[PDB]
From a paper:
The rest are acted on by the third and last enzyme in the PTM pathway, [name], Lnt18. This transferase N-acylates the Cys* of the apo-lipoprotein using preferentially phosphatidylethanolamine (PE) as a lipid substrate and generating the triacylated lipoprotein product218192021. [name] is a member of the nitrilase family of enzymes with two domains, a membrane domain (MD) and a periplasmic nitrilase-like domain (ND) harbouring the enzyme’s active site. The active site, defined by the catalytic triad, resides in the ND slightly above the membrane surface with an opening for substrates and products that leads into the bulk membrane.
Author numbering: 6 to 508
């Protein structure tokens, strides 16, 4: 028989890479089940170290093929030779692949026999703990979670109840039973798998929200398409400010809310006071509000400058003040982009090399929703929208819309900005709120309360997306409880499965 560990590692690579087809650009949702079926079936009847090796290679295919878009960021930021960046991409993919090896290795140790307890009970619970660590250890990088591939799929109804991680759970469960049915040539796990998969379908029709048409507003989002910063001089700041203002001016009397993307204003907040105070007056005059990203350096009590990635509000119902509490400061910073890991390497800084000291500061985990024109917006900047629990914790029942401002000009023309967009849609469906995503170039859109794309403008263009958005009010089960029910389910599955293994 050709079942040999060399073959299994080769197939793990292909079934892992197959998982990339499930996500935003390709959107083949059944690829998630086939992907997880390979991981489930290939680890059958293996030593714990052989299984861990197969789990690693599955993760290497998935993350190698689907996360490789980070290269362009490493290339332009890191300042490294070409093959060094390639090595660093292989490094990152390997790091994430560890958690998949850990999953397979632990699963094979406690549940070596190929049984429905292994695939249906132990696997989903362990996968939950595994995938939790991947997105937690260090800052965490929970990219490529197959739950997001169901945003338009049959399992979308599960999301507003138990959240996206419940779709991760059920998919690992259903894929496990199918791998068992195939390997053991037994139709019974197939029937259960189909039933477990089909039952959540009617839930996609439940509306846990209700719209508020009397609050319908016309919202505008300016896609500035301002290029990467090659030279910062007052000539580029004046060009940027002109582009954004000139696009906002004709909308001042019509659109109740105007949004500019992440770090849209390319100068410090303290250096723009005349501009902003004058812009706040013009908006209040015509009865409009502006929400724009800006980089804000702020003197601490210690008299040291703390630089924030901010969101500031202007206009009607949001009078601009540098001391205003109506602002959002980014919390979760990109590990190598916005801060430096291991700041304690300051010893080689002064003697020998020129080491980066440049690092952003973090805002609070919980922040009140931005108010503009009497509209409540719970903001998340860029990467932060992929963090399900953080967005839910900040979410308030009076929130009218979810707000994301991002700058994806890096990773442009790649799968990355789409995978990012796909996870932003998940937030709207989970919380039953419209989501307003204004970016610099990549994927400016409006997403309804069920995750449907309401309006969208093409990438890499200089445009304004103006459309009517009506807010929603009610509370979903996930918005109340969060992922506590899933962790309760995961505990009961792990309790049973470990108790069964220990007997
Ligand atoms: C086996 C199918 C694997 C396809 C891999 C894929 O999805 O292609 C993504 C591409 O590598 C992104 O640059
Ligand atoms: C890191 C994992 C790289 C894949 C090789 C692991 C390996 O060869 O182990 C297979 C098995 O343990 C040998 O019979
Ligand atoms: C199928 C195996 C997929 C594994 C692919 C892993 C290779 C790592 C990689 O994709 O790096 C390429 C580089 O980043 C290009 O921009
Ligand atoms: C030992 C590893 C320590 C890693 C810390 C060194 C990383 C340096 C860094 O993060 O800077 C990257 C920046 O994008 C380019 O200037
Ligand atoms: C140029 C940078 C390269 C950086 C290199 C470090 C991946 C392991 C694997 O899957 O290979 C197993 C093989 O298929 C079994 O024959
Ligand atoms: C030891 C029983 C507990 C199992 C817990 C495992 C946890 C491993 C997690 C990640 C490592 C993934 C990297 C894969 C490296 C394994 C390859 C290997 O070492 O296999 C060589 C084998 O000894 C040749 O016969
Ligand atoms: C014995 C084996 C249990 C080991 C680890 C369980 C760790 C899971 C407990 C972590 C609690 C979840 C959490 O605090 O993080 C929330 C996260 O953002 C959303 O899942
Ligand atoms: C996040 C919400 C998703 C959670 C969903 C909760 C569903 C759990 C219910 C039952 C477990 C399924 C176990 C079914 C076992 C399959 C039947 C089977 O395999 O029996 C044939 C056997 O091979 C011959 O001995
Ligand atoms: C998708 C692949 C799913 C594979 C499920 C195969 C189930 C099967 O082979 O059924 C056995 C047969 O019914 C016994 O008489
Ligand atoms: C799949 C299991 C989900 C079954 C549907 C349960 C719906 C539910 O949780 O009830 C909501 C209640 O009104 C609390 O607000
Ligand atoms: C002996 C080897 C053991 C191997 C283990 C494999 C199976 C793991 C099973 C269950 C993990 C239990 C974790 C459950 C903890 C519940 C966490 C919780 O209360 O939720 C936090 C909250 O929801 C945040 O927002």
């Amino acid at each position: 028989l050709i079942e040999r560990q060399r073959i299994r590692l080769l197939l793990a690579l292909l079934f892992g890479a197959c998982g990339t087809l499930a996500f935003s650009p390709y959107d083949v949702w059944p690829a998630a089940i086939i992907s997880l079926m390979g991981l489930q079936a290939l680890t059958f009847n293996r030593r714990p170290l052989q299984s861990a090796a197969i789990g690693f290679c599955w993760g290497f295919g998935l993350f190698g093929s689907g996360i490789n878009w980070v290269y362009v960021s490493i290339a332009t930021f890191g300042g490294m030779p070409g093959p060094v960046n390639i090595f660093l991409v292989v490094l990152l993919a390997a790091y994430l692949s560890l958690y998949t090896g850990l999953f397979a290795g632990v699963l094979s140790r406690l549940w070596p026999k190929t049984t429905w307890l292994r695939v249906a009970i132990a696997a989903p619970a362990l996968w939950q703990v595994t995938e939790f660590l991947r997105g937690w250890v260090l800052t965490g990088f929970p990219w490529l979670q197959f739950g997001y591939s169901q945003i338009d799929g049959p399992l979308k109804g599960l999301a507003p109840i138990m959240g996206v991680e419940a779709i991760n759970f059920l998919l690992m469960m259903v894929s496990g039973l199918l791998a068992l049915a195939l390997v053991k040539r037994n139709w019974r796990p197939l029937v259960v798998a189909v039933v477990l998969f089909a039952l959540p379908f009617p839930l996609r029709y439940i509306q846990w929200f209700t719209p508020q048409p009397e609050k319908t507003i016309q919202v505008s989002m300016v896609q500035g398409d301002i290029p990467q910063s090659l030279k910062w001089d007052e000539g580029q700041l004046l060009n940027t400010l002109k582009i954004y203002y000139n696009a906002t001016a004709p909308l001042m009397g019509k659109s109740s809310l105007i949004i500019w993307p992440e770090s849209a204003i390319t100068d410090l907040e303290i250096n723009q006071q005349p501009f902003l105070k004058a812009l706040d007056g013009e908006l209040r005059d015509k009865g409009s509000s502006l929400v724009t990203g800006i980089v804000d350096a702020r003197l601490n009590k210690q008299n040291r400058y703390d630089t924030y990635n901010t969101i500031i509000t202007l206009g009607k119902g949001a009078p601009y003040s540098y001391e205003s509490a109506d602002r959002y400061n980014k919390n979760h910073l990109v590990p190598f982009g916005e801060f430096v890991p291991l700041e304690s390497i300051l010893r080689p800084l002064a003697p020998f090399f020129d080491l980066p000291m440049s690092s952003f500061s973090r805002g609070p985990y919980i922040q009140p929703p931005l108010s503009a024109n009497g509209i409540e917006l719970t903001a998340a900047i860029c990467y932060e929208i992929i963090l399900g629990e953080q967005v839910r914790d900040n979410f308030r029942p009076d929130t009218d819309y979810l707000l994301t401002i991002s700058n994806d000009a890096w990773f442009g023309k790649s799968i990355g900005p789409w995978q990012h967009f796909q996870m932003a849609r998940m937030r709207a469906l989970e919380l039953a709120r419209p989501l307003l995503r204004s970016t610099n170039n990549g994927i400016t859109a409006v997403i309804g309360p069920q995750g449907e794309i309401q309006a969208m403008i093409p990438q890499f263009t200089r445009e304004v997306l103006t459309t009517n958005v009506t807010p929603t009010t009610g509370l979903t089960p996930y918005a109340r409880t969060g992922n506590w029910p899933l962790w309760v389910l995961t505990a009961l599955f792990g309790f049973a499965a470990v108790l069964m293994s220990l007997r």
